Design a protein around this nucleic acid. Sequence first.
DNA 1: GGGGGAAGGATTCC
DNA 2: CACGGAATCCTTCCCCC
Length: 341
Amino acid sequence: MIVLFVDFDYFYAQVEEVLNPSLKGKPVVVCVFSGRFEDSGAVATANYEARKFGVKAGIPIVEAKKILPNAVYLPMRKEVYQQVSSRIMNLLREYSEKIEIASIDEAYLDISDKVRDYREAYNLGLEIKNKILEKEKITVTVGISKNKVFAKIAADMAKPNGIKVIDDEEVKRLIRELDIADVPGIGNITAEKLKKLGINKLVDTLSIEFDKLKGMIGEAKAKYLISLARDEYNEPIRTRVRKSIGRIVTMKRNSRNLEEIKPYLFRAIEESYYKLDKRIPKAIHVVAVTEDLDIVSRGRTFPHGISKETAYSESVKLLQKILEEDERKIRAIGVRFSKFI
DNA sequence: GGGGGAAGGATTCC
DNA sequence: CACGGAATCCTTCCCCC
Ligand SMILES: Nc1nc2c(ncn2[C@H]2C[C@H](O)[C@@H](COP(=O)(O)OP(=O)(O)OP(=O)(O)O)O2)c(=O)[nH]1
Ligand SMILES: [Ca+2]
Ligand SMILES: [Ca+2]
Ligand SMILES: [Ca+2]
């Protein structure tokens, strides 16, 4: 089997560079202002002109302007990027019936019934790149390997706007030389727990008794790495469907006053419903971020669908439950609707 | 003993 | 920090055969 992964380059920023070409070459930073205090907020992403100086996703906008005080800062317009993405995905379909969308800029494609041998795949990659570049003026990176995991990795390497195949012979090479940390699904928390077990390389996951390895990093994550190390990972590509829709927002200032937090909440709810399009959720969760950037949530599942009127009512209670259970001040508030019918 | 869920949270990632 | 959004796995408690 052969898998081709697609990972659009610095997406949000490039989509802005495409809508306003006068940007190209310049340092571009797509921001997410919270309204808290002037320039307060994070960075969704940035183009490579800005990335060359540390300005990346996650860091505070303020920390960015310190580095590049003259870079171009644009507010994140998720909706617009969403549509562009949609199209690009629709385009890929005409390359394989088997397609799995991992995010707003990631998709796997099983070209087993289209290509034979990697060379033909590598060419199909270029055939796709040029196609995308032409139709939407958007460069992307393509990773090719036997399974989704290695395909993604291959991509990570070729970045930006590149292509790369990982033949079975090299696959074995990575299981030993490749850093365990860089393996998809291995954040800081996990990588560290592995650093102790002594597992610094993928292959090392074979020098530990399943139980200890399992009891340390969960059963699922355990079997996961073990199959990858044994060179037997082979998850199929499938059409995933949104399991939930939500909306969150940072208040002008921390709070614990029911009436002061309500307005924000009702807005998240009001919007989350519109987002629902024509979906009817059976579960409603109220998420809250305390003064120390912590997250607590209380929800509830019903035997029937939830109406907007019901969302309002219930949402209040859950928020009340939160307050009387956490003395901390609430920095942000929002909702989450799941368990659609 | 163990299936069955629900809920609250931990983790990873875009 | 300093934002949003979302999936998956995990621990835990609760009801019952
Ligand atoms: N709002 C928000 N967006 C994020 C965050 N992290 C990543 N994103 C955005 C960046 C892109 O718009 C999209 C895809 O993430 P990548 O990790 O693919 O970012 P980018 O497009 O720069 O990929 P690239 O490194 O150029 O290959 O998700 C985040 O923490 N907050
Ligand atoms: Ca990506
Ligand atoms: Ca990307
Ligand atoms: Ca990692």
